[PDB]
């Protein structure tokens, strides 16, 4: 039934973290 | 094939995951004036946001009989080598098409947006570039560039450092003289002088996007937009069944990960 892979493992949360940027 | 020369960095990150998610951490708060021995009310904390992009997968197929291979060796056409090279070439062309216009379904509707047709802010120019004066063509392209810059609050990271326009429009700009009264110098030669950081590129892909030409400025920075190709072109080993050789080749590719919304701008109609 359905599948074998848990949903959250079908998503790769990127290791690169993007900091918020503000005016110069 | 100008996308990979278009400055966008390609990131093969999430191998076979069906989605790629990026996280942003923003600092909030600020310092407060305090006395010599006072307890502050200035607290620095941080929050975050998440952005996800689905990953789809394309797969092509080629095949050849042994009679085919031997007969074509008469012509010095190496069907294994030529088929593998066709796979690679079509993969490069597909990556270019995906980066610029994304993926369109076979029936006709479109599923993923690319760089050209992304949901950036799009302003329509006065008239077509051919009908348009050299000064007004310069004004249109420069108004696009600086409108994007104002949108990003002129942050060096998100500031548009590249512009891609249809080869028709790029040639027109390169050959339209800005004003005859000054010199023969062209509109493109004026833009390349007043915007020494923006490199102007071109693509045939822009000739017609959504029923009209589409120029667009964007920033080729990792933190502004990336080209997600999580699975580069994987060509299977040749499966021989009798004398019939068979090859599949799949690559799993996400679209253009436009990390920041107002990191590009469109001139619709030129």
């Amino acid at each position: 039934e359905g599948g074998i892979i848990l949903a959250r493992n079908l998503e790769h949360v990127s290791s690169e973290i993007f900091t918020q940027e503000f005016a110069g | 094939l100008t996308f990979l020369q278009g400055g966008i960095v390609v990131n093969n990150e999430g191998g076979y995951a069906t989605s790629v998610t990026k996280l942003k951490l923003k600092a909030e708060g600020g310092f407060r004036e305090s006395g010599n021995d006072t307890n502050t009310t200035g607290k620095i904390t941080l929050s975050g946001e998440s952005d996800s992009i689905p990953v789809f997968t394309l797969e092509g197929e080629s095949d050849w009989s042994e009679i085919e291979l031997k007969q074509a060796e008469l012509q010095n056409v190496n069907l294994p080598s030529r088929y593998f090279e066709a796979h690679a070439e079509l993969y490069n062309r597909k990556i270019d098409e995906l980066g610029y216009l994304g993926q369109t379904r076979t029936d006709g509707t479109q599923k993923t947006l690319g760089l050209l047709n992304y949901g950036f802010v799009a302003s329509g120019a006065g008239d077509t570039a051919a009908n348009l004066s050299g000064d007004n063509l310069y004004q249109a392209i420069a108004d696009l560039i600086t409108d994007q810059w104002a949108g990003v609050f002129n942050v060096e990271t998100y500031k548009a450092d590249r512009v891609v326009m249809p080869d028709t429009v790029y040639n027109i700009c390169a050959k339209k003289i800005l004003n005859s009264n000054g010199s023969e110098m062209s509109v493109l030669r004026a833009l390349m002088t007043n915007f020494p950081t923006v490199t102007f590129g071109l693509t045939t892909k822009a000739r017609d996007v959504g029923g009209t030409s589409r120029t667009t400025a964007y920033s080729s920075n990792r933190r502004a937009m990336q080209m997600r190709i999580p699975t580069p072109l994987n060509v299977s080993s040749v499966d021989q069944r009798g004398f019939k050789y068979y090859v599949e080749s799949y690559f799993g590719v996400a679209g253009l990960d436009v990390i920041e919304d107002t990191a590009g701008r469109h001139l619709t109609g030129l």
């Binding site: 599948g3 848990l6 | 379904r105 029936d107």
Partner: protein, 160 residues
């Protein structure tokens, strides 16, 4: 809650929406489809999209929604726009494939398959009884053998 059915009496056979690849077989990818497309059911083709059987004039049965082994854990469902997004609808249109059957149905080998054509949960379920409500004669398809509980491996003689 806890794992369902701690101990099962027998090893369950093939789940619905599964295709045996020993025999000639074809599962064909359709990119556009309907959200909530139940796997292991007959699926129709309408307006250039693979969608669930529902009461219509004469739906174009395009085959059996293939169950993805490496899909999201959960109900057999094809999803769009989620963490469990399924890019294409994998549909089995040739060969031997497992389809759920109506719990009332008691089919047998070489019996003409009938799909269910209703706007209900029973949409796309197979059956032998032709007097069943919304029984649509699937062209050139026969029940082959009972695989699992309320799941039968049928044989599509030609493509669907």
């Amino acid at each position: 809650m806890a794992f369902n059915n701690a101990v099962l009496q027998e090893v369950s056979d093939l789940p619905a929406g599964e295709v045996i690849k020993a025999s000639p077989h074809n599962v064909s990818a359709f990119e556009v489809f309907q959200n909530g497309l139940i796997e292991g059911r007959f699926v129709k083709f309408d307006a250039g999209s693979i969608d669930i059987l529902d009461a219509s004039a004469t739906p174009t049965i395009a085959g059996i929604a293939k169950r993805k082994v490496t899909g999201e854990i959960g109900p057999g469902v094809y999803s769009t726009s989620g963490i469990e997004i399924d890019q294409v609808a994998e549909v089995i249109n040739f060969g031997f494939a497992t389809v759920t059957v109506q719990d009332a149905a008691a089919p047998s080998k070489y019996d003409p398959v009938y799909a269910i054509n209703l706007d209900s949960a029973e949409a796309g379920k197979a059956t032998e009884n032709s007097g069943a409500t919304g029984a649509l004669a699937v062209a050139d398809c026969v029940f082959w053998e009972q695989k699992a509980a309320n799941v039968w491996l049928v044989r599509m003689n030609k493509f669907l």
